[PDB]
Amino acid sequence: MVKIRLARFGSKHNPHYRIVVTDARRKRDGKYIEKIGYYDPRKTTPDWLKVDVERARYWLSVGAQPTDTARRLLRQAGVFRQE
Amino acid sequence: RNLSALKRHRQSLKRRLRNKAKKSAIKTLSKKAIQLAQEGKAEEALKIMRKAESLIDKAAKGSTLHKNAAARRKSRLMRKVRQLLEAAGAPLIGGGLSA
Amino acid sequence: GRYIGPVCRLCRREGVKLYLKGERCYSPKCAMERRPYPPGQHGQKRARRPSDYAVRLREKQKLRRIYGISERQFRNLFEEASKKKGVTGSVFLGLLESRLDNVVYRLGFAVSRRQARQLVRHGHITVNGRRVDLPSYRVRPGDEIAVAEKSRNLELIRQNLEAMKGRKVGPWLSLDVEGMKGKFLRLPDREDLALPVNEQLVIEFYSR
Amino acid sequence: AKGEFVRTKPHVNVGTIGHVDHGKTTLTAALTYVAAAENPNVINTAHVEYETAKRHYSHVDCPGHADYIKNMITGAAQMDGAILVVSAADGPMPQTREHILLARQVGVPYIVVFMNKVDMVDDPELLDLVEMEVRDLLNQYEFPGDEVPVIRGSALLALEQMHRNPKTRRGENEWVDKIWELLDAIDEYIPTPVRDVDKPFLMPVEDVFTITGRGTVATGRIERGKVKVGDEVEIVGLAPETRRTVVTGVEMHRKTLQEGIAGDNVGVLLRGVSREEVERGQVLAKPGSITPHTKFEASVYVLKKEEGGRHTGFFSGYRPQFYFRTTDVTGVVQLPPGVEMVMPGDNVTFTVELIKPVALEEGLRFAIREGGRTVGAGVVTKILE
RNA sequence: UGGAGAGUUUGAUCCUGGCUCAGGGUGAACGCUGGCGGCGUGCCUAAGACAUGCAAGUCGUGCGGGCCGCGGGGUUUUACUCCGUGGUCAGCGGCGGACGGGUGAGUAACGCGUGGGUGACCUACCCGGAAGAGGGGGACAACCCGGGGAAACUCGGGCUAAUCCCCCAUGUGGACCCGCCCCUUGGGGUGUGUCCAAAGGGCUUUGCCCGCUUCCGGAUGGGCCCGCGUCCCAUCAGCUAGUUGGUGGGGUAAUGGCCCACCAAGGCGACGACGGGUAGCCGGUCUGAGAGGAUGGCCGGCCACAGGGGCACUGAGACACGGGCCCCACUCCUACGGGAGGCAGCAGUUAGGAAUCUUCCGCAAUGGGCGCAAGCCUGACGGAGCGACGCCGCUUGGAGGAAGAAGCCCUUCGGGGUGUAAACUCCUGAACCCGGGACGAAACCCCCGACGAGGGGACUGACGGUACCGGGGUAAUAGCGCCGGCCAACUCCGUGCCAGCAGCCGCGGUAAUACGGAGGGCGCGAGCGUUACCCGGAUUCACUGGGCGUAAAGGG
RNA sequence: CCGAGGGUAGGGCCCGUGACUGGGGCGAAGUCGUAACAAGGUAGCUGUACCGGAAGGUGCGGCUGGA
RNA sequence: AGGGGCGUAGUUCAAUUGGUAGAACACCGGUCUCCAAAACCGGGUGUUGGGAGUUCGAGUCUCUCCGCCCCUGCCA
Numbered sequence A: 001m002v003k004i005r006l007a008r009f010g011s012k013h014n015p016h017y018r019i020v021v022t023d024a025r026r027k028r029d030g031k032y033i034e035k036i037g038y039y040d041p042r043k044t045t046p047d048w049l050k051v052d053v054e055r056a057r058y059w060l061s062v063g064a065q066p067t068d069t070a071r072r073l074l075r076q077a078g079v080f081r082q083e
Numbered sequence B: 001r002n003l004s005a006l007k008r009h010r011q012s013l014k015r016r017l018r019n020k021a022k023k024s025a026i027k028t029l030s031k032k033a034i035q036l037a038q039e040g041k042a043e044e045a046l047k048i049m050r051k052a053e054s055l056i057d058k059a060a061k062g063s064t065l066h067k068n069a070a071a072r073r074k075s076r077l078m079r080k081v082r083q084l085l086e087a088a089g090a091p092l093i094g095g096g097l098s099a
Numbered sequence C: 001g002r003y004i005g006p007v008c009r010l011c012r013r014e015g016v017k018l019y020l021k022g023e024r025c026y027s028p029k030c031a032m033e034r035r036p037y038p039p040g041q042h043g044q045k046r047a048r049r050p051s052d053y054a055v056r057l058r059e060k061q062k063l064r065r066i067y068g069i070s071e072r073q074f075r076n077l078f079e080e081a082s083k084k085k086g087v088t089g090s091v092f093l094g095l096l097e098s099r100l101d102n103v104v105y106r107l108g109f110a111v112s113r114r115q116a117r118q119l120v121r122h123g124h125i126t127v128n129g130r131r132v133d134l135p136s137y138r139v140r141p142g143d144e145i146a147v148a149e150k151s152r153n154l155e156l157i158r159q160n161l162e163a164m165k166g167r168k169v170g171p172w173l174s175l176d177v178e179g180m181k182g183k184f185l186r187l188p189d190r191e192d193l194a195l196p197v198n199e200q201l202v203i204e205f206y207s208r
Numbered sequence D: 001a002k003g004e005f006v007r008t009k010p011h012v013n014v015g016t017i018g019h020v021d022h023g024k025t026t027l028t029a030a031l032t033y034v035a036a037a038e039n040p041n042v043i044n045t046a047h048v049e050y051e052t053a054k055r056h057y058s059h060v061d062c063p064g065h066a067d068y069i070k071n072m073i074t075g076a077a078q079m080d081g082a083i084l085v086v087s088a089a090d091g092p093m094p095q096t097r098e099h100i101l102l103a104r105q106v107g108v109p110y111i112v113v114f115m116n117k118v119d120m121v122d123d124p125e126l127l128d129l130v131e132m133e134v135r136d137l138l139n140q141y142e143f144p145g146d147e148v149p150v151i152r153g154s155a156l157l158a159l160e161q162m163h164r165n166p167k168t169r170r171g172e173n174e175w176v177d178k179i180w181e182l183l184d185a186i187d188e189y190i191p192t193p194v195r196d197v198d199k200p201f202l203m204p205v206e207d208v209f210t211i212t213g214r215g216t217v218a219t220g221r222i223e224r225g226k227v228k229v230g231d232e233v234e235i236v237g238l239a240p241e242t243r244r245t246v247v248t249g250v251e252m253h254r255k256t257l258q259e260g261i262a263g264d265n266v267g268v269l270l271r272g273v274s275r276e277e278v279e280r281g282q283v284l285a286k287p288g289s290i291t292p293h294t295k296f297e298a299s300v301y302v303l304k305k306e307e308g309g310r311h312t313g314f315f316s317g318y319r320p321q322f323y324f325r326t327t328d329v330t331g332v333v334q335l336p337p338g339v340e341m342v343m344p345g346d347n348v349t350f351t352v353e354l355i356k357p358v359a360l361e362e363g364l365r366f367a368i369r370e371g372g373r374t375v376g377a378g379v380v381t382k383i384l385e
Numbered sequence E: 001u002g003g004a005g006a007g008u009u010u011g012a013u014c015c016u017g018g019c020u021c022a023g024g025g026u027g028a029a030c031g032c033u034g035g036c037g038g039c040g041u042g043c044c045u046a047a048g049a050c051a052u053g054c055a056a057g058u059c060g061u062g063c064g065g066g067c068c069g070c071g072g073g074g075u076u077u078u079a080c081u082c083c084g085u086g087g088u089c090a091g092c093g094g095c096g097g098a099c100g101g102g103u104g105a106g107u108a109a110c111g112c113g114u115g116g117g118u119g120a121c122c123u124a125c126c127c128g129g130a131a132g133a134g135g136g137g138g139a140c141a142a143c144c145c146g147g148g149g150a151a152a153c154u155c156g157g158g159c160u161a162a163u164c165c166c167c168c169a170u171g172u173g174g175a176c177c178c179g180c181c182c183c184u185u186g187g188g189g190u191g192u193g194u195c196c197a198a199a200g201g202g203c204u205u206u207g208c209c210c211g212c213u214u215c216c217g218g219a220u221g222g223g224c225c226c227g228c229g230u231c232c233c234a235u236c237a238g239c240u241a242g243u244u245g246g247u248g249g250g251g252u253a254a255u256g257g258c259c260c261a262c263c264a265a266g267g268c269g270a271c272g273a274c275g276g277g278u279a280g281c282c283g284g285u286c287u288g289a290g291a292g293g294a295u296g297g298c299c300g301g302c303c304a305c306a307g308g309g310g311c312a313c314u315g316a317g318a319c320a321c322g323g324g325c326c327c328c329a330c331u332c333c334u335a336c337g338g339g340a341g342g343c344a345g346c347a348g349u350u351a352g353g354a355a356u357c358u359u360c361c362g363c364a365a366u367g368g369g370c371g372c373a374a375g376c377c378u379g380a381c382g383g384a385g386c387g388a389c390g391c392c393g394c395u396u397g398g399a400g401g402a403a404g405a406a407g408c409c410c411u412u413c414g415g416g417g418u419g420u421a422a423a424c425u426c427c428u429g430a431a432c433c434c435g436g437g438a439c440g441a442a443a444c445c446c447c448c449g450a451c452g453a454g455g456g457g458a459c460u461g462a463c464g465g466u467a468c469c470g471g472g473g474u475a476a477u478a479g480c481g482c483c484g485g486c487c488a489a490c491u492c493c494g495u496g497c498c499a500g501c502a503g504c505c506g507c508g509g510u511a512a513u514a515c516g517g518a519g520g521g522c523g524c525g526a527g528c529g530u531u532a533c534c535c536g537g538a539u540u541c542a543c544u545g546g547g548c549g550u551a552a553a554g555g556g
Numbered sequence F: 001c002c003g004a005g006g007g008u009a010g011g012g013c014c015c016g017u018g019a020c021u022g023g024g025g026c027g028a029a030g031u032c033g034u035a036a037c038a039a040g041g042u043a044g045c046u047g048u049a050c051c052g053g054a055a056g057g058u059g060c061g062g063c064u065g066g067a
Numbered sequence G: 001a002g003g004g005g006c007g008u009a010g011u012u013c014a015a016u017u018g019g020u021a022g023a024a025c026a027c028c029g030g031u032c033u034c035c036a037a038a039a040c041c042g043g044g045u046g047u048u049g050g051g052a053g054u055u056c057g058a059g060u061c062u063c064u065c066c067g068c069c070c071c072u073g074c075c076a
């Protein structure tokens, strides 16, 4: 199906994923349906996790299974909070 | 020395036989249906073609024909038969057809 | 690696006195003060009108030799100095002054250039807090260069730090002589750097 | 499907000798079948092996015969004790002589004997004569021929009586038995040397192979220290320059070894090396140990005619061959002035220039031959180049 | 925001013109030399052949068994072992093995690029909606026994379970023929007739969770079709029978000659058909002032292939890299009647070659398959290794130190040079040593709250005792090319059209800045040269930007 | 029915090779002459044709890039 | 690794009754000249592949050794 996974960019010992929506079948670093965010797991910078709520939510509303860890970050970004 | 994908093969042969039969049926049962449709058996014709139209949608249930494939086989049947029975016939006992 | 070898051998040859040794090269014997001629066996005979090429070569070598920067970096830094918006003349000269060790030398600390490098390669030098050891480190605005503490008591750092009392630093650097700091207020200017180099040529030499 | 090798018993390797045909090769077969009963469970030198319920043995069976000398030498240059085989038919044979003076030319301590083809023409004086002939010959080459274990016992007999059945213990065969007589005459009398393991590492190369799906293997007779999987090494000697490699294989008689020590004939699979890069003669040593050289002064003693060597001596400019560890490289001879007159049995020192780089280290003996006859032996002194 | 020219035809000059050099570039190789680190990157040739190990599985919360360790005797003991229950072998059944990973052989073509079309279609799993899930029957494995067999495994008789199969009902709806209406290529609504559904599994149990069936829609991924673009030879000029179109069929998810009968004679070509050669295309990459030229390796997208070749089966999807059937060639086993394999998956071997790496560690992260879950698998991937193959950073010290040691080289024998270079003085501390030592890892999961929101809790690091930090701390590698002009750099000796050099012009025939050595110098430095190939210079195929009276060029 | 492959037969394209043979380029100091360059000692060049060891000669016509 | 070959001036080749090794053409050396070619005088210019052996004497006859060609060898 259409997932919301993390694609690895950046150099060696310097990872930098890009939160993205892709068909669960594509290579993890291959072409993707739409980027909606990035995440530096080592922080090394105030901004190490931004996401695009409006889009993240939309995909979730049409069937886009997030990853165990991908979901954690949408969460931390504040996508499922409803008030 | 091997790997267990063989489960998929044996299995393959099995159901490759299941719809092989379901299929050869629809066929031998479609022919006879029309093989009368030109004779004029009307009533009996629509009888078989009615069993025919069953066996087709039937196979459509599993991985044998599925959708439109079945729908085509039907349309041609409920076509040839009809197109034949009009060569001096009139549809006796309301078979699958609807005039 | 950074030459290492007979330098007041280039004060000569380039015929434009050089003080890559500092103290001595500043004395009544810069080597230059006894032989205003190139080395070799000949070195003192008529000279063919140096070719349009030669001039540029000498101009470049004049400069590059004047830092110790080995070509590779020299010429490399040059290219960066090109794309950067502006006159390559200023820029480049400026990007040559941004060289950590250089500034070190530019702000007392070390008698000469070759010496300022080692100070860097041993830690003795420090920037905006944390220390640094890459002679190539490029200084940016508002950053002060401070000596380390383990050194401050070293026989060398003394005498060298002393020569500041009285003498003033370049018009783009400060200096807490007692607190060995001094910032890099801003990239130096063509005029501020009174160098025996005709940048415009050194530039033409890389066209061909 | 491979199976490791595990240590228990000490280890001493040996080989057979004696005039061609007599009795080796076929006998060698036997000794294997025998110590195969009650253990374990169940033209070109042939390494094989077998173990008495007392010690581990590595067996080298040089095909013998003339023409095959250079190859022969490298065999008795690595064995601790030779099994001088003799047939109870012909007696002290010529090659039995040559496979002897050699042994004394390579040191080879102690030589067990064995009268083969015994089950043939009995004779009072004979069997008691043959054993007399031999000893009368071993002392003819300064060996302990008088106190030498002379077992009798035509071995083929042992073989064919073990071929009917792969299981038979001692005493049960008036023909096997005659084997164990040697397997106790060897167990005893034949010492167990001391190989320095505290020393660096070295291993002359005997043969080189290429095990399919692996690469090049080099078999040799450990000199000093040791070598286990994953140790870097320099292939010093012969070729352009000393290449380097990482040992990634060590096996004892086709059985995985854990750290073959000195005196162990193991096969070492080297990492990334082609069969053309590894020749015989050259050496495997500890990286930094030993260096290839061609000019050296050596303290040499030229054998006397009566002692085998030359009988006309020579002058400066003579080019004999030199034997180190495992090969034969040629060399030009240059004398330290006035030494021009170098006659037999003389003892002096000059300088040699080999036409091929070789692992020399000062403190290493060698051997000068020429025209089919060890002309003299010496040792490396100072190294010029 | 961007354009440099030189040598060489002549006694000399101007022009024309070719050759050559100075600049970048590379999956490079070869020579001399080689210290550290990071990040990249590494069979361009035989799409040659390959030992060995691993590259795909998972669910008992779908079902019945085998066997073992244990509730513990079923009756009262080893009778009907019913079952409690965590496991372990295979079978049944489901989902995944069609993705990921490899290669460039084939292919000049809707293959790719780009823009569109589908009233001519499909899409497992994933979302939103609607309606359901009632009765019934049956088989084959596994297992028991018998048989042939070297083996791989097979035949026969008979039990048995299901979410395996089939029959009837139900008909929200859907499919089909005919009619009507809307719409316009097969779409949408509608009426009469006919035809079609479905399975139970675990719990904490009139409720949930995971499933199941039918239709509609959403997503994503696809098929097919169309316009334009896409190399060299015209010494290749004509090509075409399923050929071009029609009608009715078969076929398919679907269009279509895709295939078939019958009919008609068509279709295509200098706007280059047919044929021959070479080649996977692109984003891009190198070069260029630009227009262009060259190229398509790494990474990303599409295509194609899986020893050579043909075919289908299962299925949402394959005519299927580690599935199947068959032929072939090759290699191997064999109890000679039949069996076995396909590294262009990762490591590795051999061959070929100027040349291209470890049978490594880890699933810790990311990503994937299956599972309610715990979790299992994963040579995808994250790392590590090797090679100056490349880029970048760093080192071999710094400051003093003589009208200037020695040695070597020149000399108008006064001296000049190598040279502040050394020695020598202080000074720092690459390496190494001791101590400390990461980020990358927070959720799956658990507890409060409803298994929602939100808050808290616990496990987990291959790289590594590495980076990094603190303290201690030794003066500690240098080479390669060139020095006639182009082109930075000159003397002595040797040789004597010899030996040799040479990119172009040319150097050598007894005083050679050109050969070879030395001193000295210039350039660049863990590098420096050499060879091959691309662009530039070459306005030297000229669109930008050239020419033809006599230099090549006006057709009789 | 079709069909991989195999088999007989005959065409097309291209590549390698062949006794012998044709001319071509190149190669310090070979042989014969003397065609051309100065009416180059017969103005040269030229298309064609015949002839001659060789350059070349002569015929016919043409050119001036000859007087 | 083991057999069997093959190695003579600068090249192609002759002496194998065991006897300093020549034959041709080259090249070398002078003279003339700048220096060659030509011409004229004058010359074997060889590591008999190396090194030893036997022998009064070795290209020849032994052995060993270098390079090359051919054949057979060669899974820890």
Ligand SMILES: C/C=C\C=C\[C@@H]1O[C@](O)([C@H](CC)C(=O)NC/C=C/C=C(\C)[C@@H](OC)[C@@H](C)[C@@H]2O[C@H](/C=C/C=C/C=C(\C)C(=O)c3c(O)cc[nH]c3=O)[C@H](O)[C@@H]2O)[C@H](O)[C@H](O)C1(C)C
Binding pocket: D073, D077, D097, D098, D101, D102, D104, D105, D106, D107, D140, D141, D142, D306, D307, D308, D323, D324, D325, D326, D365, D366, D367, D368, D374, D376, D377, D378
């Ligand atoms: C000999 C070949 C290779 C040697 C290689 C090396 O040798 C060595 O370097 C070795 C080190 C000492 C070495 O140099 N060997 C090299 C030399 C070593 C020589 C040593 C010891 C001597 O002593 C003076 C020793 C033999 C001595 O001789 C005597 C014998 C005399 C015989 C005369 C001949 C007689 C009657 C006879 O009939 C006869 C014959 O035999 C042959 C032919 N025709 C004949 O008619 C006696 O037996 C003594 O014992 C090491 O061993 C290395 O490790 C090695 C093995 C690699």
Ligand SMILES: Nc1nc2c(ncn2[C@@H]2O[C@H](COP(=O)(O)OP(=O)(O)O)[C@@H](O)[C@H]2O)c(=O)[nH]1
Binding pocket: D019, D020, D021, D022, D023, D024, D025, D026, D027, D063, D116, D117, D118, D119, D153, D154, D155, D156, D157
């Ligand atoms: N009867 C008998 N024959 C033997 C004996 N030893 C050897 N042979 C035979 O004689 C020959 C021995 O030659 P081989 O074994 O090759 O010994 P090598 O030639 O010395 O290695 C072969 O035919 C053996 O079978 C023995 O002890 N008894």
